[PDB]
């Protein structure tokens, strides 16, 4: 009952951020903290003095020890670094240093850093490094799960998405006497535009093990809710650029609208670059998808596992309906986009599944198949194919039928 026994459990319930732990530490929120209205556990901190959260710890849990083990976890979503000003600029984001001793989380260009400091000028730093010179990044502007553990007799460890990345001995450190407060605030950042998103902060008064960490990752992933590429909840009525996970240098296009045209994967993507700062594939390419309410959605705008939907496709600034005639030859049913008034009795009902998958069905509820792609001669056409469904029934791996939904996001910054 690992979150339940945490010594600090910050969560947004009804109308307030609160510490749910038995300690009920005090929270002070600055004027310029922003909470996402879709999910107010998602907290945005700007490079402003009033964009801060302070936690006043109960005296019982202030860290002051040579020997006590402790850990912290949280999720973070860090916008792409765009500017030379971001190089060589380590900035604190979670501060628990007082009198030059304690702990802190800081960031730098392509880095997440944990620092410990004793009362005898000793220091230890574990670091996660990620590149901005990468076609498609797992990390830039995407939610990722951080976990840091500390065993005073041996090592400090940093985990990303449940996996151990770095470790260093901390037996070079004597007494660590951390602050009575924890300050969530960008401290020392030279770039006025910088911000972070954070969520689900916890402290623990032991060293978490690998298993506990993986289980926290899985539990906090919200697996009944589909996610977009950035890790935010997938929504209805929101345009998405599509990325097929088996061929990430292509985007979705449509040769011609109507039943005699088809959807296909076209490449290459272009690139976006700032010399010495980033070099990535362009994400805002192709014919956008919009998820439309059909049988689900009666409570909010969020797309959930097993929701039945329609998919609209934007072609030259007009919406069309993804559909197919399942009567066509062969298992692989080539997808088209149809004028919405003219879709008739074509197969168009999509069952969303949480990576994201889409199972096409006819109007009687029979499966046409998962949406993927199939090579016909020299073209990768989008299809619905029951071959995928039958491989899943046999517990066999399937390639080509998993998708990313990429909305425009300011933390990506592409035009
Ligand atoms: Cl795949």
Residue numbers in the entry: 872 to 1225, 1234 to 1294
Manuscript excerpt for this entry:
Clostridium botulinum neurotoxins (BoNTs) cause flaccid paralysis through inhibition of acetylcholine release from motor neurons; however, at tiny doses, this property is exploited for use as a therapeutic. Each member of the BoNT family of proteins consists of three distinct domains: a binding domain that targets neuronal cell membranes (HC), a translocation domain (HN) and a catalytic domain (LC).
Here, we present high‐resolution crystal structures of the binding domains of BoNT subtypes/A5 (HC/A5) and/A6 (HC/A6). These structures show that the core fold identified in other subtypes is maintained, but with subtle differences at the expected receptor‐binding sites.
